[PDB]
Amino acid sequence: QNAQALNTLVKQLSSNFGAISSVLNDILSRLDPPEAEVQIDRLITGRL
Amino acid sequence: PDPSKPSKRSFIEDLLFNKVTDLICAQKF
Amino acid sequence: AYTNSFTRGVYYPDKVFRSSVLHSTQDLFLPFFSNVTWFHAIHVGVYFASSNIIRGWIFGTTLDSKTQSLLIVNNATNVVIKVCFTFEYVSQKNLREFVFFKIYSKHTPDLPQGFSALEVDLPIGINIAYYVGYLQPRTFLLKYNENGTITDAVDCALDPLSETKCTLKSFTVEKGIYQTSNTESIVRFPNITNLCPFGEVFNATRFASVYAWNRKRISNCVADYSVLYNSASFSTFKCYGVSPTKLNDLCFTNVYADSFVIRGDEVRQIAPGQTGKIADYNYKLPDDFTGCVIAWNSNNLDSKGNYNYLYRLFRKSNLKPFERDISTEIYQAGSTPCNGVEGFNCYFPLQSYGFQPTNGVGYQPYRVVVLSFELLHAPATVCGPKKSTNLVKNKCVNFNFNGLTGTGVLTESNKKFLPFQQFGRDIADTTDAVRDPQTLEILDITPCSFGGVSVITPGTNTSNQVAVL
Amino acid sequence: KIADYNYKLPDDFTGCVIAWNSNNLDSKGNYNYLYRLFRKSNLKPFERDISTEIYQAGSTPCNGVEGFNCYFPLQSYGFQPTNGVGYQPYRVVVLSFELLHAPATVCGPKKSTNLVKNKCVNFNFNGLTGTGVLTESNKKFLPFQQFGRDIADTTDAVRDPQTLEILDITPCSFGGVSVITPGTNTSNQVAVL
Amino acid sequence: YNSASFSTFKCYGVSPTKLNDLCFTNVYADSFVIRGDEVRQIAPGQTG
Ligand SMILES: CC1=C(/C=C/C(C)=C/C=C/C(C)=C/C(=O)O)C(C)(C)CCC1
Ligand SMILES: *[C@@H]1O[C@H](CO)[C@@H](O)[C@H](O)[C@H]1NC(C)=O
Ligand SMILES: *[C@@H]1O[C@H](CO)[C@@H](O)[C@H](O)[C@H]1NC(C)=O
Ligand SMILES: *[C@@H]1O[C@H](CO)[C@@H](O)[C@H](O)[C@H]1NC(C)=O
Ligand SMILES: *[C@@H]1O[C@H](CO)[C@@H](O)[C@H](O)[C@H]1NC(C)=O
Ligand SMILES: *[C@@H]1O[C@H](CO)[C@@H](O)[C@H](O)[C@H]1NC(C)=O
Ligand SMILES: *[C@@H]1O[C@H](CO)[C@@H](O)[C@H](O)[C@H]1NC(C)=O
Ligand SMILES: *[C@@H]1O[C@H](CO)[C@@H](O)[C@H](O)[C@H]1NC(C)=O
Ligand SMILES: *[C@@H]1O[C@H](CO)[C@@H](O)[C@H](O)[C@H]1NC(C)=O
Description:
This is part of a larger assembly, with five copies of chain A.
Chain A: H1 2-11, H2 24-30, H3 33-47
Helix pairs in contact in A: 2-3
The complex binds retinoic acid (REA) and 2-acetamido-2-deoxy-beta-D-glucopyranose (8 copies).
PDB class: viral protein/inhibitor
Keywords: viral protein-inhibitor complex
Entry title: Cryo-EM structure of the SARS-CoV-2 spike glycoprotein in complex with all-trans retinoic acid
């Protein structure tokens, strides 16, 4: 049980939570801060 | 506990250790 | 003439009152336990602190009167600030601080342990006894008293005790263990040497009609669009997948150049999700679009009147995304199948533009070129102007391989890629193994933060000695 | 060539932008206007640069020669009354500012009433709104010090923008009612707490 | 769009593409004549 819950916590870094992509560097290298922030925030609210 | 084995594990405590049983590195990163 | 800073420093940061609060402020302060350069020599963010002989001070990027200089001078109760010995600012042992365009104020009367607390914003708009000091970005947790006076503050990077105190927002840490938390640049772009047909797709003497919009692939170009805004004046440019500023930092897997000529009052219809006789019967843009749209006036050339341009007007079905349709079967709006007769309730599909030099703005021809592409996929051909450095071979780097950024140590790889295979993604869909865009070799990325520090400590009351783990 | 080599607006901008046609006045043609066209580096936010060192696009350091791969930095506008809309001069004024910081000078037209001295009010002190009872204060501000923020970063003590006195704000909702009741079937009589 | 050429069309409740799929309970047609440099002021939340 304790090795299955923690594996989902890593599987869930592959979901973009409705953002442009699921890799933070992608978003940082495709968008300026004014529009980058509004996507990072739907990542930061998805992982937390 | 037996004198022969280096540790003080008894003949039934060892039958339990040898019965209960990359990605862990990724978790570490 | 180095000397050790003891307790001086901290200044009232902001204009908001606070009393009996252990506030934490992230600003540049004077370090504790730092080197002041005491100067007594009488027989060129920064800090400053000092019979009032020194008055002012001068700076600039080069200071040769070719660029902007800056002179600030104080007096008994007066100052003069200029760009010279375009702005004319004029106003009304011992440490009278002249603290640093951001200058500070509030002087107050080696150095003992007293813990003083210090505090006009002077605009420039340009590029830039007797003690000294410096400021660097280092967190400080201030202890506002019951009357508003800063009675205590803690450096937040000085000692392990300081980090634990910051973590707990407290001045007294008890016995135990606390779990506090714990390079160069590489740019690699492909070996493309030639530009792209800027002067072939943007200034062609004739563009196609809308209903039969031309199409052209571009490949193996290092497109420096800066050379473009010298000749033409673009009346519209709105990129829809990527922010415009970063257009010279990535690589674009495939690129297309759709070109046509619409009227002025239709250029707004080239956008994802709109309607009109351009977005329904001629050229439909997909909803998940990624690309840029360019449009400028062309009444100088495409005008006589000019009847060489057509557009589809009648149809019973809307176009799907990117769906060219060329046909001349006349439209049937009624009942009978009109076989070529432009008669009642049955008309020709295509009509023309009456482009004319006398047409009001909005009826003038507007050349349009859209550039669709796709970002950060595996194979990339067209890229940005920026150059390429050399590999560092096992040092931590902020690499920029073929568009994508990323931090880590670039160790050597042994990943048995396919000759077709480029990028290795990990279990968490985070890239870790890459193919060099020039040497065609394989590199492995190891991010390095290496966390997990802890601070074994007896009670801070009991002692100060601490042990790190 | 305006947002890279002439005038760059910061990303965290706050302000308003105004622009109107001016072909009536700024036209002859009018060659009294210039713009920087060649540069190897983009401007940072609000970075005026005036210079005449000609641009070096090639290899040799052209010392003033507007020759091959080395040109002058500045060019002119051919403003003309015959220019089509889009080539006409457009005066532009941007007004940058910063809101609801402590010291405020320029304000709006609206007038000012008088203080109420300990009654619940929807005050409008110097921009910021807020509800509460405006009691008298004793907060020992600095003569430099204006606004008092609470532990939850919610303002509670203010300096009057006219009398330069200090007021304390006490929000008033005063909650916590409860309804002692027997079964509504049993009766209707209820007691409040 | 066979006769006139519309210089502005921005629907504010419903996406323009779907305008031929719904039914509209009540509809009003306000009409007037403003100058060219004011047409932007007809939008929720502007001044002029
Ligand atoms: C369906 C419909 C409406 C909009 C129809 C209009 C007014 C058509 C605009 C055509 C354009 C926009 C063509 C062009 O640009 O040439 C609304 C919902 C407003 C109310 C009446 C029924
Ligand atoms: C400060 O000065 C001392 C000499 O007193 C020197 O040993 C030290 O390296 C200097 N720098 C720091 C960061 O202490
Ligand atoms: C400084 O002030 C004195 C009088 O207070 C004046 O005589 C002198 O010219 C001033 N120096 C300046 C303005 O540089
Ligand atoms: C705060 O002010 C009161 C009133 O004068 C004084 O008695 C007290 O000592 C002061 N305390 C501090 C820490 O300034
Ligand atoms: C396109 O052709 C025109 C006409 O000669 C020229 O002025 C312009 O500089 C050309 N554009 C490019 C990018 O070469
Ligand atoms: C890319 O260019 C560099 C420098 O010209 C050269 O060393 C390298 O061999 C080239 N690689 C390929 C695949 O052409
Ligand atoms: C603090 O330490 C001193 C001496 O080490 C001791 O006398 C005192 O009781 C201690 N108090 C607390 C609260 O630990
Ligand atoms: C502000 O104006 C009012 C009314 O004119 C006056 O009563 C008050 O004293 C003034 N305050 C200051 C600081 O000038
Ligand atoms: C409701 O009240 C009546 C009389 O007070 C009683 O006869 C009845 O049993 C009650 N029923 C319930 C569900 O409380």
